[PDB]
Amino acid sequence: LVHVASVEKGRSYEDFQKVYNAIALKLREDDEYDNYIGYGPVLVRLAWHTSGTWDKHDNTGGSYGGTYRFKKEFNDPSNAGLQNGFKFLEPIHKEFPWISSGDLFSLGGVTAVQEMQGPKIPWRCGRVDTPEDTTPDNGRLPDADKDADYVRTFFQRLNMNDREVVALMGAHALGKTHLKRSGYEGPWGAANNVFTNEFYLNLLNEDWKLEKNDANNEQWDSKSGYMMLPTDYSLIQDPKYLSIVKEYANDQDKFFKDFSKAFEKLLENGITFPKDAPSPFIFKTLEEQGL
Numbered sequence: 001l002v003h004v005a006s007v008e009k010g011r012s013y014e015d016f017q018k019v020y021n022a023i024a025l026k027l028r029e030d031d032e033y034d035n036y037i038g039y040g041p042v043l044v045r046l047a048w049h050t051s052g053t054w055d056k057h058d059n060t061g062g063s064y065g066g067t068y069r070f071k072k073e074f075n076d077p078s079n080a081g082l083q084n085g086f087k088f089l090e091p092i093h094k095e096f097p098w099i100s101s102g103d104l105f106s107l108g109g110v111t112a113v114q115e116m117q118g119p120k121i122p123w124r125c126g127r128v129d130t131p132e133d134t135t136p137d138n139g140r141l142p143d144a145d146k147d148a149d150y151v152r153t154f155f156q157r158l159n160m161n162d163r164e165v166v167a168l169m170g171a172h173a174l175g176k177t178h179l180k181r182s183g184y185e186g187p188w189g190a191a192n193n194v195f196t197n198e199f200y201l202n203l204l205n206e207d208w209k210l211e212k213n214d215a216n217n218e219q220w221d222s223k224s225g226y227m228m229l230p231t232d233y234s235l236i237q238d239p240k241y242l243s244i245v246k247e248y249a250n251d252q253d254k255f256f257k258d259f260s261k262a263f264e265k266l267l268e269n270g271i272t273f274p275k276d277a278p279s280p281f282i283f284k285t286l287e288e289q290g291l
């Protein structure tokens with residue numbers, strides 16, 4: 001199965017900047033969500049989970065088909081809570097009904113990262129909705145209770161290497177774990193709706209204790225009130241991951257650049273872009289537009 005990007009008919013960069021802007025303006029307006037964290041983090045997670053079902057071996061799942069809109073995928077236990085991101089995007093989709101679902105879910109993530117002062121993420125259009133029977137089964141998203149070997153093997157299926165994995169995990173600066181959602185509870189840091197390299201700094205610099213939460217799962221906790229999942233902590237237990245964690249803790253610009261590449265790649269896995277497709281778009285933030 002080849003998925004060829006097909007530009008929404010007649011649309012160009014300005015059309016998608018309008019969608020970006022509507023997302024960004026709602027992000028600003030709907031600021032109460034999740035005890036004033038706002039929707040940025042869950043939109044980033046929605047983009048990742050809608051992309052992260054991909055299997056490089058047969059090109060099943062991935063962002064192209066926008067299959068989260070079907071009940072098998074929106075009810076995946078691994079996706080608990082993402083319905084909030086979907087509901088956020090609904091009025092956006094109503095205003096811009098021409099955008100594909102995959103294009104909107106992925107653009108939500110890009111827009112959230114950038115509006116949270118993260119790196120620019122180049123973004124390409126052209127995902128096309130595919131039918132209900134193309135929805136991937138549950139179970140392709142990762143478990144959090146595992147070690148570095150798990151994480152490394154998991155991400156090979158998404159064609160990600162060690163650097164790409166450690167970079168992508170930096171998104172756990174954002175938002176928080178919610179006990180009723182994942183069986184884990186707590187934020188990873190203080191700046192959880194501003195995109196920074198804090199995840200790496202906290203991994204290295206907090207004093208972590210292995211505790212059980214109220215769902216009887218182990219997680220790493222600090223006196224500052226932060227947490228790390230076992231899979232996060234695995235990034236400092238494994239010496240290869242550890243080196244890269246230290247690199248990003250010590251170079252914010254490097255983290256931004258590597259995150260941007262890896263996140264674009266994640267969002268584009270499975271898609272074939274024709275030779276004459278438009279170049280990737282780099283959207284201006286609201287701030288850059290004076291909006």
Ligand code: HEM
Nearest residue numbers: 041042044045048142143144168171175176177178181182
């Ligand atoms: C080994 C890989 C990963 C595991 C096991 C993992 C697991 C988790 C878990 C358990 C949660 C908490 C869900 C909740 O209770 O609300 C979470 C939240 C989140 N994850 Fe991941 N994650 C991984 C990779 C990633 C990647 C690659 C990204 C994106 C680049 C990402 C972005 C997020 C964000 C932004 C949140 C916060 C969501 C919110 O506040 O609503 N995660 N992750």
